[PDB]
Design a binder for these strands. Structure first.
Ligand SMILES: *OP(=O)(O)OP(=O)(O)OC[C@H]1O[C@@H](N2CN(C)c3c2[nH]c(N(C)C)nc3=O)[C@H](O)[C@@H]1O
Lengths: 129, 48, 279, 126, 48
RNA sequence: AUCCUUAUGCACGGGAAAUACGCAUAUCAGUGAGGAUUCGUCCGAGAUUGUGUUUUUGCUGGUU
């Protein structure tokens, strides 16, 4: 608790490094209930410019949407994170189509090409929501 | 226009239709006078 | 849980009808976040039914209401002008907003199937939640509108208390509003922006907010509007920054007097126009 | 001078002002600087700032006094310099300027002047 | 006085086009793609 | 001592433009000029007003 201080710990830590990839993920996770809605767009640009590229930034920005809403808007991001691929992304993907429909089996082969309980877990993670 | 946008959507992809509807607003000057064109079609534009 | 928590807060405010306002600050971000959920949750339900309505009707309250009206069985017999009348009367719309609905009604959605019972329930439950939230938000502003002389003596002096109350209810506090940089203010009370909006004013004001409706703007000829938002929007933020600074026990106006004097005198000069030239 | 504004704090001396205003201008020419209040207030919200400089004799002073309370939450140093007219020049502007925020680029050429001056400024905040 | 087309009037109009195009089986015109065959031929025509 | 960066000054050499360049006992202007927006926000310094010259400014050379 006191995520309020986590605002500053990110800041101090991010002043020092900053290009680090992880640190921006927690700067992002913040805006979820960080409730500062204005600057979120500008900060996703910086996170995506500062580290550029990456995965976890793209994945976390994606999830910030899926968490909220707009299951269609979070698709672009998660799909955009794959083209740079690694198991963290696929979970959110199947979740999205669940809130969407009918695409599930065909996407499945891709999974095997990126590889065993990975088939068995996917269901484990599909039961989360 | 509010009809025109719809009809062009029917026959075209919105991104263009929106442009066509927008291009006809403008602000028309003749020497000292000036009025926005809300209602009619301006026939001086190429796609008219 | 909503109805339980909602009923008391309206009465908790009505029972009082200072300490609350700091709680008020916390609340304003919270209500808004939830509404953008429920609104975006209702869209999830009509993606199948009527995909274009998301665009054409932007705000949740007018979207949630049209959800119902359109969903209602009684109107659906067909060749009912009741629909039109209803929209106009019930979920406030202007002629322009209906024309789009009518035609968009033809291309996209299917009336062959009327949405299922489960989903109907969800909508009803979602609509009720939305209404509860919206009422709460509306109530908050009035209470704010009552305290304006107390919390923001300068801002009411320029803009007028009807509006100041609307502004401060957006960031949810004087502090928050003082943080806002002046370019972003003028766009607060803007309904939204869609492609077929079909707008270019004579003014040349691309963004029309709550401030745009104020006194210090529309008391002047139409040519000087785009110059007077900007000139006023800055002095609002200067006023709002002073209000946060000001001690709660004593609030003194005086800053406003300069900032009106300048503004009225400055607006005159823009209008005045050139002195005539020797040939 | 005139009575230096009691709310002005930390107030840089003569020797620090020369060292600060010189950094300002040195950043202006690399366009790492941002001038004015709102431009500076924008910076902090984003999180790119290094330190804020303000005018002490800004008339009335209450219009910038919000910056200090914002800076303390983002952990960003700040100081007042004794005139606005001088700060106007350093930013490359004809006309008076009451606040300015140097920004971050960690590939920058001047990086080592900045850490120098923040080190000096944070001392003043006791 | 607002737009003179009246909502009830509009449906009658817009409905006719909708049936015609569908009757005629009309694919809508796409947006001009970045890679498009005729971009050259259609610039030269247009500029000349 | 070498080397490197930015600003300013004089300068060889190479280009582009003059519908362009200025001037004012004159109005405002980061205490926000003037714009952009995917509507969430984003850039941040000149805009008015009167005026001077603008198919040309100075300077040489040929041929009649
Ligand atoms: O060029 P000259 O020998 O005339 O320099 P000066 O005689 O003016 O005298 C003292 C200065 O010499 C410079 N030097 C000289 N050397 C060899 C040297 C210098 N500086 C450094 N550093 C400071 C890194 N390293 C050296 O090896 C200095 O400027 C002295 O002030």
């Amino acid at each position: 608790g006191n995520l309020d201080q986590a605002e500053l710990l990110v800041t101090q830590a991010l002043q020092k490094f900053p290009s680090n990839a992880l640190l921006w993920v927690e700067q992002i996770k913040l805006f979820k209930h960080g409730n500062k809605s204005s600057l979120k767009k500008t900060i996703f640009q910086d996170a995506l410019r500062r580290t550029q590229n990456d995965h976890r930034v793209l994945l976390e920005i994606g999830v910030s949407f899926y968490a909220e809403a707009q299951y269609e808007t979070s698709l672009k991001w998660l799909e955009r994170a794959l083209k740079k691929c690694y198991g963290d992304t696929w979970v959110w993907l199947f979740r999205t189509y669940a809130r969407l429909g009918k695409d599930t089996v065909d996407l499945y082969n891709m999974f095997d090409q990126c590889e065993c309980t990975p088939r068995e877990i996917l269901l484990r993670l599909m039961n989360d929501k | 226009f509010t009809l025109l946008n719809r009809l062009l959507r029917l026959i075209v992809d919105p991104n263009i239709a929106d442009y066509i509807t927008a291009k006809n607003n403008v602000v028309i000057n003749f020497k000292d006078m000036s009025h926005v064109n809300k209602y009619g079609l301006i026939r001086g534009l190429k796609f008219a | 849980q909503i109805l339980p928590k909602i009923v008391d807060l309206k009465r908790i405010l009505q029972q009082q009808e200072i300490k609350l306002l700091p709680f008020f600050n916390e609340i304003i971000p919270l209500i808004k976040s939830n509404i953008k959920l429920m609104h975006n949750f209702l869209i999830s339900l009509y993606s199948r039914r009527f995909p274009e309505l998301s665009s054409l009707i932007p705000s949740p309250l007018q979207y949630s209401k049209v959800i119902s009206i359109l969903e209602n069985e009684n109107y659906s017999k067909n060749e009912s002008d009741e629909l039109f009348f209803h929209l106009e009367n019930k979920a406030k719309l202007t002629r322009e907003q209906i024309l789009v609905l009518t035609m968009s009604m033809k291309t996209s959605f299917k009336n062959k199937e009327p949405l299922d019972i489960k989903t109907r329930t969800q909508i009803l439950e979602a609509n009720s939640i939305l209404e509860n939230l919206w009422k709460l938000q509306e109530d908050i502003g009035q209470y704010i509108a009552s305290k304006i002389s107390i919390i923001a003596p300068n801002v009411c002096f320029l803009v007028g208390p009807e509006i100041a109350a609307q502004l401060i209810a957006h960031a949810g506090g004087v502090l928050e509003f003082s943080r806002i940089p002046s370019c972003n203010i003028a766009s607060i009370g803007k309904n939204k922006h869609l492609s077929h909006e079909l707008h270019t004013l004579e003014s040349g004001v691309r963004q029309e907010g709550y401030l745009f409706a104020s006194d210090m703007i529309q008391k002047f000829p139409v040519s000087v509007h785009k110059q007077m938002l900007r000139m006023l929007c800055a002095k609002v933020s200067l006023a709002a920054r002073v209000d946060a600074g000001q001690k709660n026990g004593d609030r003194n106006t005086v800053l406003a007097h300069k900032w009106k004097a300048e503004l009225s005198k400055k607006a005159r000069k823009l209008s005045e126009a050139p002195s005539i030239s020797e040939t | 001078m005139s009575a230096p504004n009691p709310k002005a704090f930390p107030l840089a001396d003569a020797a620090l002002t020369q060292q600060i205003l010189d950094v300002v201008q040195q950043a202006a020419n690399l366009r790492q600087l941002k001038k004015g209040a709102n431009e500076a207030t924008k910076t902090l919200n984003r999180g790119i700032s290094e330190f804020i400089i303000m005018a002490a004799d800004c008339e009335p002073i209450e219009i910038l006094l919000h910056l200090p309370l914002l800076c303390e939450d983002k952990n960003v140093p700040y100081v007042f310099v004794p005139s606005r007219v001088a700060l106007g020049r350093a930013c490359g502007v004809s006309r008076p300027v009451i606040a300015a925020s140097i920004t971050t680029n960690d590939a920058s050429a001047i990086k080592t002047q900045i850490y120098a001056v923040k080190d000096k400024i944070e001392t003043l905040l006791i | 006085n607002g737009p003179e087309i009246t909502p009830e009037e509009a449906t009658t109009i817009f409905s006719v086009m909708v049936e015609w195009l569908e009757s005629r089986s009309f694919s809508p015109i796409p947006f001009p793609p970045l890679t498009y065959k005729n971009d050259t031929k259609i610039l030269v025509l247009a500029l000349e």
